[PDB]
Amino acid sequence: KLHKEPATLIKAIDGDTVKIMYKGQPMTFRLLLVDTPETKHPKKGVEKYGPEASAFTKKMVENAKKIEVEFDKGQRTDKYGRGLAYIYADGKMVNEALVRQGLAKVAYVYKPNNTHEQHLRKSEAQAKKEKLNIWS
């Protein structure tokens, strides 16, 4: 059973990555199950909708009263040291919000870290049907 834990925003870095204070330790977190266009793309740079995905995550985490992180059932950090997780801004899942707004695609999934996969795929189909941003 996944549960949420409190955390404190330090800084937003990209649409898909935020620095957070977790159990008193600053850490970089990668949002589970989504791929946003990047501004810090290692290869191409600042892709289309990159700045947009980026300001959205920023605003969202920044204006929140309460940030919480929720780990999935698999590994909790990636090979770069980044925490892997679902992030909640006042009860709303940032990863889902991005996909519903057409500012992220559901990422290639790695079990057993796939607990909200279906949900998100559902939000992606809707942003697609509404042809938003990425899907326009």
Q: Which residues are catalytic?
A: 30, 38, 82
Distance (Å, rounded) from C-alpha 22 to C-alpha 102? 29
Asked if residue 78 belongs to a known ligand binding site, the reply is no
121: left (phi over 0), alpha (psi -120 to 50) or beta: alpha
107's tokens: 């990422």
Q: What angle do CA 124, 20, 78 make, to 5 degrees?
A: 65
Asked if residue 90 belongs to a known ligand binding site, the reply is no
Asked if residue 16 belongs to a known ligand binding site, the reply is yes
Q: What is the DSSP string of 77-94?
A: B-TTS-EEEEEEETTEEH
For residue 118, the one-letter residue type is Q
Q: Which residues are annotated as a binding site for Ca(2+)?
A: 16, 35-36
Q: Which residues are annotated as a binding site?
A: 16, 35-36
